[PDB]
Amino acid sequence: AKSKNHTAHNQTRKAHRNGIKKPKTYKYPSLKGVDPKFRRNHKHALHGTAKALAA
Amino acid sequence: ARRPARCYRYQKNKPYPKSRYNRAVPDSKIRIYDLGKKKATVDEFPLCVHLVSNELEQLSSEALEAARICANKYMTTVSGRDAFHLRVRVHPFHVLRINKMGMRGAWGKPHGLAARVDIGQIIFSVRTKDSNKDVVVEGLRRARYKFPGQQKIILSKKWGFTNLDRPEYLKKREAGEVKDDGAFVKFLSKKGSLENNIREFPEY
Amino acid sequence: VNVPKTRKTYCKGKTCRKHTQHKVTQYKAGKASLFAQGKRRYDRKQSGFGGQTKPVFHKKAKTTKKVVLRLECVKCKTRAQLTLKRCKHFELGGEKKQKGQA
Amino acid sequence: GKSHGYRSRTRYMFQRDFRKHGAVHLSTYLKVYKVGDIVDIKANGSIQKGMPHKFYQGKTGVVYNVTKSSVGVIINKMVGNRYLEKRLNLRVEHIKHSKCRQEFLERVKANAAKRAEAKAQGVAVQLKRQPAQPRESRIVSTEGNVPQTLAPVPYETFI
RNA sequence: GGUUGCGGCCAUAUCUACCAGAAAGCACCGUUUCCCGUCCGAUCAACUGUAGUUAAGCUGGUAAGAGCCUGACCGAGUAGUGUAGUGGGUGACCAUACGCGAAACUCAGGUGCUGCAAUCU
RNA sequence: GAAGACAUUGUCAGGUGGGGAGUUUGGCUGGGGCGGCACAUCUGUUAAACGAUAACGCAGAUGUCCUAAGGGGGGCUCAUGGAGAACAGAAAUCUCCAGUAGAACAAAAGGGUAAAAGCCCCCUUGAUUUUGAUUUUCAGUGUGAAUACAAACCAUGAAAGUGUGGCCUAUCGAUCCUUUAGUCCCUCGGAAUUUGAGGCUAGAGGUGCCAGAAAAGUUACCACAGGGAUAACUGGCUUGUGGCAGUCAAGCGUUCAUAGCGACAUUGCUUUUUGAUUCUUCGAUGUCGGCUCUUCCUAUCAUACCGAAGCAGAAUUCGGUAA
RNA sequence: GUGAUUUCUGCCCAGUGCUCUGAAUGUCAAAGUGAAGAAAUUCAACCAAGCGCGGGUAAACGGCGG
RNA sequence: GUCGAAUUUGGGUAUAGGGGCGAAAGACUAAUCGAACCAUCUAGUAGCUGGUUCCUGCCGAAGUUUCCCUCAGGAUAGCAGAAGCUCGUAUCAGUUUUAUGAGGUAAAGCGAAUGAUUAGAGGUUCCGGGGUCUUGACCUAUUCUCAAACUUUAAAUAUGUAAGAAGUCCUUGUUACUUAAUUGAACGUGGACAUUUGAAUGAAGAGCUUUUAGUGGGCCAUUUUUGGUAAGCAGAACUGGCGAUGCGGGAUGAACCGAACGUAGAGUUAAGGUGCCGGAAUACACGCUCAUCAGACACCACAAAAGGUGUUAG
Ligand SMILES: [Cl-]
Ligand SMILES: [Cl-]
Ligand SMILES: [Mg+2]
Ligand SMILES: [Mg+2]
Ligand SMILES: [Mg+2]
Ligand SMILES: [Mg+2]
Ligand SMILES: [Mg+2]
Ligand SMILES: [Mg+2]
Ligand SMILES: [Mg+2]
Ligand SMILES: [Mg+2]
Ligand SMILES: [Mg+2]
Ligand SMILES: [Mg+2]
Ligand SMILES: [Mg+2]
Ligand SMILES: [Mg+2]
Ligand SMILES: [Mg+2]
Ligand SMILES: [Mg+2]
Ligand SMILES: [Mg+2]
Ligand SMILES: [Mg+2]
Ligand SMILES: [Mg+2]
Ligand SMILES: [Mg+2]
Ligand SMILES: [Mg+2]
Ligand SMILES: [Mg+2]
Ligand SMILES: [Mg+2]
Ligand SMILES: [Mg+2]
Ligand SMILES: [Mg+2]
Ligand SMILES: [Mg+2]
Ligand SMILES: [Mg+2]
Ligand SMILES: [Mg+2]
Ligand SMILES: [Mg+2]
Ligand SMILES: [Mg+2]
Ligand SMILES: [Zn+2]
């Protein structure tokens, strides 16, 4: 007994019931995948400027 | 053993020509496309008559061969062997398929050849003298019975097989801008080197 | 394929930590001990009545085995393992291909 | 069986332009990309390293990372009923600066100049774009332009 | 404006056949002790600027030139196409309504521009 | 009388053992079976110019091969054609010219490449070590493959640089167990030493039904749960095939296309053939033929009345109204 | 196993079975024996029947082409 | 059929369920036999069939993705309900516009490459073969016709991004990164510019979390489209529907046309209709048609090639 193989019928209508969410944007995006050499120095740069404003 | 032509009348599939993917295809039933005095000069046959298709369909190679024989035989008998130049303007390049014995693995094998014609597309062309208009028209009329669908017979205003109107061709010829090369002619353009355009058409 | 008997490669022997000369041989499995815990458990389960108690593989499909090369450092005798692609013929000897002749 | 390889269905997408094969001109390598720049992706068929997948062809993204011979680009991809963030490592041959804002930065500069210029004279500086408006009234003269009458033509074959 | 070094865009720069080129530059050109490379100092290397030549390279000009580039109410609002009707037609297909809109063809014009440094009637 | 530490009997061990026991004896599928693999994958196309997209659609390919066919550098330029040189010819070797790649690049196909990614030469092992991030299939899991870095150690080149296998798109594998390498570190729980065993990190031994049960048949003596999700009758759609009827008229018919026929082509009709399909029925529509009996259709064998003939008569042939 | 009487029952022992007062240095369990080790243990030699090798057997199963 | 025997038969006795008995049929063993009957294990398991009990109110689906000895079943994501939570002009949108990208289908092209393909003409040979001059070969300029797995060019429809406060500009602090170098990179201090603050329209407000039901056989229509002679056949793409839906219309019909539903009154319409059945003009106007098988309304329940001095217009 052969049956249906594949179809995309009704799939777009299901997607538009609640979906198609535009991605939310955050200030300060995560630094995942950034060059490690840049991240090591930027950590030290942030530490130094903390003391300048604190003092 | 051949199916009726009604089974392959319409253009239901994409073109399926002979190629390195098809390969094993039988030969077309029509091999000669130019009939009569095919060596005649352009100036000899000014009148041109066309058999124009009026439907979007397919014509089998058997039908083209049958219509060619019918048209050539009548014109030769009435007008003469060398009084016209008949040219078939359609070539069968579409391969038909047939499935021979359920529907599992139903992809068919080559069956024959057909020509896919559009609306207003010329099927047959005959050039002859003006005095022979009635004979060639009757010859093309008798060929319609071999074709499915509707065809129209149109008297071309061009000079023979050229793409120019009769007054335009006469004006060029009197100015020495037409040179004969076989059954067709070559024209003179205002471009190119003078060294080449002077040795040709010295009259101009 | 053909692989030279010697190779210069990295050695993490805590004393080299650098490229050294290595001897190349072909890895072999080794005999299975009868006092390994998996073997001891299997023998206990097989005893008594009940017949075969574990699956026995039958539907072999592969025709080749991956070649593993053992590399021993000439300095510190530290060993390392490298796995190559599948091949039907493997040799460690010489007889390099000649560029062109009859 | 079916085939779904990495470069499937890319027969024409990754071809070079006509009479534009060969080496890459040097201006591609002299451009400078910074984090936050907007770039668009178009793969080059002669560079097989750092090549984007065919989905990202013609897409536009924002640079988030800079490396030796490549940059990192962020792409929003719609999967199912929501968009997911995609990060791509592409060599500079496959990207170029997007002009979708180079003509917008000049409008920002123009707005500031016009706002300051009218600050001393007139209120309502009117720095908003407007869509095309309906045409105003006008007078058309017939001096030397007398209307010419046209009629439909009869049917002819001219074949 | 000429020329050389390094370039950018990468034929308006290419290709074919001819003609011209003051000054400088470039080039051909002379030699084989040395470093170096070959069957061969032809290529590559070194030495001299001396012995010679604009013959070629190179640069520019010429051609109802080929190619290429640009434009055109040239073809053509044509082919194709989004949307609509209880429109036509046995059918194949086609017309109309609200929109978008090619290619070939034809003709006209054009034939490298330019950045940094140095130098020259 | 016989027999004797041998038989016998008891416990383990090897062989034999459908006499007997238990169990198994893939899936997809225009019914199932046989065949094939569309079951894990790759190229082009079908695919309707983002991406995605089916059929036992179309044309093919994969379970390999390579110490170089990997990495770096240098020098060089291919297919083919033209004009030449003792033997030498269509094809041997040598020289020049033209040559946008029409060559070559392990393999299928599509991309890509010319002072190279091709050919030749020199030097090499980066096809290395440590652990993360990213792309494709995707649930944003795994596996395979691939991309860009960081921290080491190296190769090559004058140098800038390039190199983490093959110019790019396929070439492959969990848990349990075994085994090897590393760390010589942790544990054997009354306390120690030494063997042995068990853990930690990284590989190998394989599941091709490729997210991975260990598996032969027969039933015409048969059973159960179901299925019209699915085959063997009618009925319905379709009409290739079967049957029947036209159009055109090259020719046949002593002469003469159409009295009677008719090639090459082409348009239909019918459901009295057989296929294709699987919609209805598997808590059942009694299944071949004959016998018996009624009615209906006309595409008319006979009978009634006519037209036509290559219809003298006779006989026959074609056609009309007619069941 | 065949199936009264009459008449006649051909060829094949390679295969599958059955069978042998055949052969010997193939394969081989537990126990036992030897060596090494501090021992657990490992290794080696020896080695029953059967199998393999050899011979017989079709009114045993069966076969009788190009 | 057999009837003097391998005869028929009473009673006694023996053989008991993987057992018996069998002149052999898988026959017989108390109407039970290809493994009897009785009780218990036992309410044995079932991805399979059937059934599953009051009302009203609000919301309201899926037959699709990936994996499975998976294909009449599950897991997983989606669609749905409920509970809410943080806030409230706020950003958003199955839409347009403006600026800027990407594509190789329709069409087109072959005197443009590759691959097919008709016809001559002018040339070429110490380099095909017959003949003392032809036919084949290539060359050059032309000519007819083509391509899902050919292509220079190349749409329409769809498709990525941007249109500001997380913005722009001025000044100058940090670092182990980077630079010949305070050069640059990244992140900051302080200062200047308010909502015609950077297009249009709309916005029963936006954002967010937990948990769980059913479903995982679909089918039809327009358009694009594959296999097949074709099918009320088989298989895809986008959208709208049926399924889950009554109501007016198509006589009749799951899908067509119109329109979607709380209980009533009045008015006006949609699609379709107004001789009678049947509510509504046997209305108006210009023509066409006579058929001894007239014709009469989309989906739709059929007709062709070929003909007529029937009639009408050209
Ligand atoms: Cl569906
Ligand atoms: Cl009993
Ligand atoms: Mg399904
Ligand atoms: Mg077929
Ligand atoms: Mg035991
Ligand atoms: Mg509508
Ligand atoms: Mg005993
Ligand atoms: Mg058994
Ligand atoms: Mg099955
Ligand atoms: Mg696509
Ligand atoms: Mg290589
Ligand atoms: Mg690579
Ligand atoms: Mg699987
Ligand atoms: Mg059914
Ligand atoms: Mg037929
Ligand atoms: Mg079906
Ligand atoms: Mg009945
Ligand atoms: Mg009954
Ligand atoms: Mg006898
Ligand atoms: Mg029996
Ligand atoms: Mg009973
Ligand atoms: Mg119960
Ligand atoms: Mg509701
Ligand atoms: Mg059911
Ligand atoms: Mg395509
Ligand atoms: Mg086309
Ligand atoms: Mg179900
Ligand atoms: Mg239902
Ligand atoms: Mg009706
Ligand atoms: Mg009434
Ligand atoms: Zn070492």
Swiss-Prot record, chain A:
Alphabetized UniProt keyword annotations: Cytoplasm, Isopeptide bond, Ribonucleoprotein, Ribosomal protein, Ubl conjugation
Domain of life: Eukaryota
GO process terms (BP): cytoplasmic translation
InterPro entries cross-referenced by the UniProt entry: Ribosomal_eL29
Cross-link position per record: Glycyl lysine isopeptide (Lys-Gly) (interchain with G-Cter in ubiquitin): 51
Major subcellular site: cytoplasm
Record's compositionally biased regions (Basic residues): 1-25
UniProt GO MF annotations: structural constituent of ribosome
UniProt region (Disordered), positions on chain: 1-36
Localization (cell): Cytoplasm
Record-level GO cellular component terms: cytoplasm; cytosol; cytosolic large ribosomal subunit
Note: Present with 51100 molecules/cell in log phase SD medium.
Subunit structure: Component of the large ribosomal subunit (LSU). Mature yeast ribosomes consist of a small (40S) and a large (60S) subunit. The 40S small subunit contains 1 molecule of ribosomal RNA (18S rRNA) and 33 different proteins (encoded by 57 genes). The large 60S subunit contains 3 rRNA molecules (25S, 5.8S and 5S rRNA) and 46 different proteins (encoded by 81 genes).
Function recorded in the entry: Component of the ribosome, a large ribonucleoprotein complex responsible for the synthesis of proteins in the cell. The small ribosomal subunit (SSU) binds messenger RNAs (mRNAs) and translates the encoded message by selecting cognate aminoacyl-transfer RNA (tRNA) molecules. The large subunit (LSU) contains the ribosomal catalytic site termed the peptidyl transferase center (PTC), which catalyzes the formation of peptide bonds, thereby polymerizing the amino acids delivered by tRNAs into a polypeptide chain.
Family: Belongs to the eukaryotic ribosomal protein eL29 family.
From Swiss-Prot, chain B:
InterPro entries: Ribosomal_uL16, Ribosomal_uL16_CS_euk_arc, Ribosomal_uL16_dom, Ribosomal_uL16_euk_arch, Ribosomal_uL16_sf
Entry coiled-coil feature ranges: none
GO (cellular component) term, any one: cytoplasm
Residues with PTM Phosphoserine: 131, 193
PROSITE patterns linked: RIBOSOMAL_L10E
Keyword Translocase among record annotations: no
GO terms assigned for molecular function: structural constituent of ribosome
Region of interest (2 X 15-17 AA approximate repeats), ranges: 155-204
Ranges for the Sequence repeats: 155-169, 188-204
Pfam families: Ribosomal_L16
Gene3D superfamilies referenced in this protein's UniProt entry, alphabetically: 3.30.60.300, Ribosomal protein L10e/L16
TM ranges: none
NCBIfam families the record matches: PRK04199.1-4, uL16_euk_arch
Function recorded in the entry: Component of the ribosome, a large ribonucleoprotein complex responsible for the synthesis of proteins in the cell. The small ribosomal subunit (SSU) binds messenger RNAs (mRNAs) and translates the encoded message by selecting cognate aminoacyl-transfer RNA (tRNA) molecules. The large subunit (LSU) contains the ribosomal catalytic site termed the peptidyl transferase center (PTC), which catalyzes the formation of peptide bonds, thereby polymerizing the amino acids delivered by tRNAs into a polypeptide chain.
Family: Belongs to the universal ribosomal protein uL16 family.
PANTHER family tied to this protein: 60S RIBOSOMAL PROTEIN L10
Name this polypeptide is given: Large ribosomal subunit protein uL16
UniProtKB/Swiss-Prot annotation, chain C:
UniProt main location, coarse: cytoplasm
Phenotype upon changing residue 55 to Q: Confers resistance to cycloheximide, an inhibitor of polypeptide elongation
SUPFAM superfamilies: Zn-binding ribosomal proteins
PROSITE patterns per the UniProt record, alphabetical: RIBOSOMAL_L44E
Record keywords, A-Z: Antibiotic resistance, Cycloheximide resistance, Cytoplasm, Methylation, Ribonucleoprotein, Ribosomal protein
GO biological process: cytoplasmic translation; response to antibiotic; response to cycloheximide
Function: Component of the ribosome, a large ribonucleoprotein complex responsible for the synthesis of proteins in the cell. The small ribosomal subunit (SSU) binds messenger RNAs (mRNAs) and translates the encoded message by selecting cognate aminoacyl-transfer RNA (tRNA) molecules. The large subunit (LSU) contains the ribosomal catalytic site termed the peptidyl transferase center (PTC), which catalyzes the formation of peptide bonds, thereby polymerizing the amino acids delivered by tRNAs into a polypeptide chain.
Similarity-based family: Belongs to the eukaryotic ribosomal protein eL42 family.
Name this polypeptide is given: Large ribosomal subunit protein eL42A
From Swiss-Prot, chain D:
Keywords per UniProt: Cytoplasm, Isopeptide bond, Ribonucleoprotein, Ribosomal protein, Ubl conjugation
Subcellular location: Cytoplasm
Entry keyword Cytoplasm: yes
SUPFAM superfamilies on file: Translation proteins SH3-like domain (SSF50104)
Pfam family, one: Ribosomal_L21e
KW Ribosomal protein (keyword) present: yes
Cross-link Glycyl lysine isopeptide (Lys-Gly) (interchain with G-Cter in ubiquitin) mapped to chain: 31
Predominant subcellular localization, coarse grouping: cytoplasm
GO biological process: cytoplasmic translation
Membrane-spanning ranges: none
InterPro entries named in the record: Ribosomal_eL21, Ribosomal_eL21_CS, Ribosomal_eL21_sf, Translation_prot_SH3-like_sf
GO molecular function: structural constituent of ribosome
One GO cellular component, as annotated: cytosol
Similarity comment: family membership: Belongs to the eukaryotic ribosomal protein eL21 family.
Note from the entry: There are 2 genes for eL21 in yeast.
Quaternary context: Component of the large ribosomal subunit (LSU). Mature yeast ribosomes consist of a small (40S) and a large (60S) subunit. The 40S small subunit contains 1 molecule of ribosomal RNA (18S rRNA) and 33 different proteins (encoded by 57 genes). The large 60S subunit contains 3 rRNA molecules (25S, 5.8S and 5S rRNA) and 46 different proteins (encoded by 81 genes).
Name of this protein: Large ribosomal subunit protein eL21A
Gene: RPL21A
